[PDB]
Amino acid sequence: MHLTPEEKSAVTALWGKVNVDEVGGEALGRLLVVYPWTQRFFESFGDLSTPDAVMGNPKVKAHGKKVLGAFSDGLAHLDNLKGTFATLSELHCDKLHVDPENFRLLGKVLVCVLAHHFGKEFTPPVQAAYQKVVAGVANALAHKYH
């Protein structure tokens, strides 16, 4: 994945401030609240009936941490997203049966959460760099589907 020197710098600088635990639970929780059909993959997580229930669900918080942790390691390998995520791509297709459109929804929510958390520091050019990155990761995760 090709980013300009300015884009890569903006991405890495912001991420150094991200607490992956906190942001990861927030991003997955909002996904389940804003786009409730995504709850179809998480029937064993318990109570997802209301926003307050989703956002305080410890299984949601845990999974969020796992998901953004893996996203985090991808940011260290921006020039080969496909190779970095190949195993997880196969896992999501063959074992979990996750429609890759969900990866794009999560990207949208993640950008909203970064904007919410960082306010004015999340400038239009920083967002633009993050949009390239979330699209690259979604494409990488979808690549081994068949």
Partner: protein, 284 residues
């Protein structure tokens, strides 16, 4: 959305389909599974082999529901009520996939109806399948705007207040940088940061949303002149409204730390989707 001439065209084409509905339904599914493999993720419990009893049976259910829809074209939301419920509460199929099946159903009809599939009928059939898809996904997020959604939107927009214009221009700037293809609609603009053209346009967009919030229960009339303008003069591809909507959400998030809760996020997203739906309602 469906003119009476559209409805006549659909009745004629589907009447031609006749007893082959079931077979055509199964062909459309096979074409979708092959051309759009990600759709197979909704059927891991099926034998998806060619000619499988599961696929043929499902194809026949799909066609009968379309038959039912054709028979009740002027009351489709009521006719497909149980099916809307089922896809929204149980199957939970991402809405993007309805477009993929619709395309494969159109390809199937084209391949079997040489005489019937004229440009006008093609157009009517495409509009018809888009309407069906719209009805099948109409209950995915609680349906239209609930009073709790309306409350949430009015509270957040009231906080926006006099900054509505300013936030309109930021949303545009974010869209132009993040989604460079949208710039193709503004070749007459200076798009540089701080441009007065972009600020003036952002204020117009913001003012229109202000009007929409104030008429949240009467949005099509409030926005009728704008629906006209986008559909018949500007002719902006409908995909682009989702992109501005996202950038408006990001803008609100960055300026509303206390207000932008998960619930208010969900309500705002539903509201901008409704606005987007109104603005593209007269395109075809």
């Amino acid at each position: 959305m469906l003119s009476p001439a559209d409805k006549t065209n659909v009745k004629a084409a589907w009447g031609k389909v006749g007893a082959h509905a079931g077979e055509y339904g199964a062909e459309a599914l096979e074409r979708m599974f092959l051309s759009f493999p990600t759709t197979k993720t909704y059927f891991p419990h099926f034998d998806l082999s060619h000619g499988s009893a599961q696929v043929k049976g499902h194809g026949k259910k799909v066609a009968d529901a379309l038959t039912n829809a054709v028979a009740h074209v002027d009351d489709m939301p009521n006719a497909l009520s149980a099916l809307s419920d089922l896809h929204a509460h149980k199957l939970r199929v991402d809405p993007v996939n309805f477009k993929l099946l619709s395309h494969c159903l159109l390809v199937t009809l084209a391949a079997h109806l040489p005489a019937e599939f004229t440009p006008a009928v093609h157009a009517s059939l495409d509009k018809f399948l888009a309407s069906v898809s719209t009805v099948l996904t109409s209950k995915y997020r609680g349906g239209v705007l609930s009073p709790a959604d309306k409350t949430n939107v009015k509270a957040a927009w009231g906080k926006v207040g006099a900054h509505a214009g300013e936030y309109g221009a930021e949303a545009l700037e974010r869209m132009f940088l993040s989604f460079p293809t949208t710039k193709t609609y503004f070749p007459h603009f200076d798009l540089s940061h701080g441009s007065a053209q972009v600020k003036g346009h952002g204020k117009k967009v913001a003012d229109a949303l202000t009007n929409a919030v104030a008429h949240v229960d009467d949005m099509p009339n409030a926005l009728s002149a704008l629906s006209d303008l986008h559909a018949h003069k500007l002719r902006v591809d409908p995909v682009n409204f989702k992109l501005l909507s996202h950038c408006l959400l990001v803008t609100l998030a960055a300026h509303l730390p206390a207000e932008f809760t998960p619930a208010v996020h969900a309500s705002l997203d539903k509201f901008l989707a409704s606005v987007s739906t109104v603005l593209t309602s007269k395109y075809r």
